[PDB]
Amino acid sequence: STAGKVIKCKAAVLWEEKKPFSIEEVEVAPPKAHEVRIKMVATGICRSDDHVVSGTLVTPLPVIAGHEAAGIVESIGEGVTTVRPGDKVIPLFTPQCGKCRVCKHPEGNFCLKNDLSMPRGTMQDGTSRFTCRGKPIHHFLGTSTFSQYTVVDEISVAKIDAASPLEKVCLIACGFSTGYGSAVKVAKVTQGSTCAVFGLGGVGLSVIMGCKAAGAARIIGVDINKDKFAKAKEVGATECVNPQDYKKPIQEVLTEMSNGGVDFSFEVIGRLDTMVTALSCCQEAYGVSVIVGVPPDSQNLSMNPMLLLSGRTWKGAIFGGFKSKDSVPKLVADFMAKKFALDPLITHVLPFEKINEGFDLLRSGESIRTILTF
Amino acid sequence: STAGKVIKCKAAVLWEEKKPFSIEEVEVAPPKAHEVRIKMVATGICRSDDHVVSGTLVTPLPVIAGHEAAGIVESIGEGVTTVRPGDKVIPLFTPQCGKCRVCKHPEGNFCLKNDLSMPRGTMQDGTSRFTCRGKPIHHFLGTSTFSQYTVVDEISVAKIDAASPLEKVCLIACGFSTGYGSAVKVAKVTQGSTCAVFGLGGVGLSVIMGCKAAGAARIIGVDINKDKFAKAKEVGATECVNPQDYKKPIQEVLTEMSNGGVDFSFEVIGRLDTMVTALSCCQEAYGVSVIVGVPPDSQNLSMNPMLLLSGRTWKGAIFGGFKSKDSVPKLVADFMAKKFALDPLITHVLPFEKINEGFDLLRSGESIRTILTF
């Protein structure tokens, strides 16, 4: 009945930086060839969504943000083969076109169709499916999950288990998979190792979960908000440190604590200074440091390349290094089989209409993940 | 007999920065416990030695530099078990104590006993075995090979094949092993891959040799001195490019040439700008860049961490990642077994007395390695 028709629905439109979202009617065009229109069920609030508001992340405005979500297919465009109406699906903010050199590479996941490197805020065809007040509205990362209905390219959606609890597994769409993969896949954390995790939000807690799953003997959480330490310990941190407690720089503190540097460190904040501090605190000859946090737009860090010459490895990743369409259904299956927990990341639940309250909770420091229900 | 006695011999003393070496008589103390006194046979001239002269590398002066050499044990101190008088040996500018957390680590080589990070210019015991005109003279990296005789700690020497041609295998002490291992061990170059090698001196040519040995399909040499290209092709470069020939930055040229970025890039120069160019020219999702070149003292580079967040790996290494005492004898055995060639690296052979002429050949661009013979 809605197939092939424009849908009027509520979305959270961001008209301007540093402003509340406006919950208002939008028009959602039907899907074109190899497009999928989804009725959203649940979306998380990730700090990257907040980066759009703050201008830390630059993407064209006005926009419908949101990238951490799950929903139910309303309709498919011509030529779609991988989902059907009524399927539970996760929009993939990192696409998997399956055809580019990255998709073909055994270790690549940052598909060349992404809209992250140089955001256009469109569908793959360079156009928008969203109208508000008669004006075209940008997409975000090909997902735009802050809407009762979105339209995504086929390469940006994965079918997931029909018995999935969508209010939980939406976290597999970003924060859990990112943090857990950054530990298990990107860093390849080893049994008995010492890890340091900078930033104890949803993503950093997910890194801790991955380090614990990998067998790390010591997992040191690092946050300037000590209110984050209890949850970090619950999911596997062996100890937590607040840089503000120490006269010396925290890289020196962590080097002392680890008797000469940690095996694996993770930047899970988004600061240039903590990206360098995290590199420095891993052991100089064999340490590995993984950048997870999103840096501020167009800003360069400064570092001494002797940190690398001695033997350190420095790397970053999007989405925990997971090939998105292959991995999201497997992660959902593994969650169904209790191979990892998502509840420790969910601190608050709100209706979608209380999105601004959700962002207030993240900005105050209170929440980890707020899950919004449509 | 010289054993147990001071030796007066000839050495190349560097009294201050940016001056010629002084070829003159020094006194060489006998070895103390766990020390080895070596009659030098051949030493290479590595750019790192020139860095001490130029002040690119800071180490206490006055100094007997030189770190790429081979010789014959003259005597051993109490408690030495791994070499004997008459043995061919290579001094190890990266030690292998065998006891430290790095030496115990399967992928560590930068032994904590090294004299690189925070150079003291002494033996392990914090004293010098060298005097000249009544003045104590510093060691360099535990090796000091620009002397007819040196004294090294046991952990800084490896016994090698008695039939070794020391005028060739001296290059296994630094430049060959560094470049080859940087490709085969540190980058882990894959069969069929595309490599970019920045700097086509002795070390960069050894990187090419390693990339070819690893089966790379394409090996692009990059140098501002086109006179370096012919020998780069001889040892495996498939293409060579001179940045000065192009209007665009060379990272853009190399990304275009490799249809979206190289698999593996290597900085083998020692410039901050080429370290960032080399990182940028590797494919953004799965590329690997290795820093080999020694950066100038205390200078930071500037870079955009989005280069790593997309999926790049950035690493560095000393001595090609090789655990020095285990590896050197095996590398010399492999050379003896015709597994790789060293002659392509040797452009000049001079008496030791012509050390300054050897440095002038390096600085002018003419030479790859000059071997000095005692």
Ligand SMILES: NC(=O)c1ccc[n+]([C@@H]2O[C@H](COP(=O)([O-])OP(=O)([O-])OC[C@H]3O[C@@H](n4cnc5c(N)[nH+]cnc54)[C@H](O)[C@@H]3O)[C@@H](O)[C@H]2O)c1
């Ligand atoms: N690479 C990816 O694919 C990916 C995915 C998801 C999130 N991100 C980014 O990862 C970062 C973390 O996201 P999140 O967990 O949702 O955010 P969050 O909940 O804001 O957590 C960040 C944590 O960092 C802490 N913090 C802030 N400053 C400092 C400091 N100077 N030192 C130590 N701790 C500090 C802060 O108190 C908070 O608990 C953000 O930059 C995201 O944009 C990246």
Ligand SMILES: NC(=O)c1ccc[n+]([C@@H]2O[C@H](COP(=O)([O-])OP(=O)([O-])OC[C@H]3O[C@@H](n4cnc5c(N)[nH+]cnc54)[C@H](O)[C@@H]3O)[C@@H](O)[C@H]2O)c1
């Ligand atoms: N990591 C290690 O363990 C290790 C070992 C040995 C040498 N090194 C360092 O490796 C570097 C190379 O040593 P080497 O091969 O003996 O030196 P080299 O023979 O002087 O070779 C350097 C090459 O770089 C070329 N070059 C200079 N500037 C540029 C530029 N802007 N762009 C492109 N090419 C340029 C130059 O023409 C020359 O052919 C030096 O910095 C050494 O100190 C490090």
Ligand SMILES: OCc1c(F)c(F)c(F)c(F)c1F
């Ligand atoms: O949180 C995931 C995430 C990222 F990791 C980014 F690098 C990015 F630009 C972005 F928009 C995003 F949502």
Ligand SMILES: OCc1c(F)c(F)c(F)c(F)c1F
């Ligand atoms: O060429 C080898 C070499 C290095 F790689 C250094 F980092 C250094 F400091 C040095 F003195 C040296 F000789």
Ligand SMILES: [Zn+2]
């Ligand atoms: Zn792709």
Ligand SMILES: [Zn+2]
């Ligand atoms: Zn996110």
Ligand SMILES: [Zn+2]
């Ligand atoms: Zn050691």
Ligand SMILES: [Zn+2]
């Ligand atoms: Zn050298």
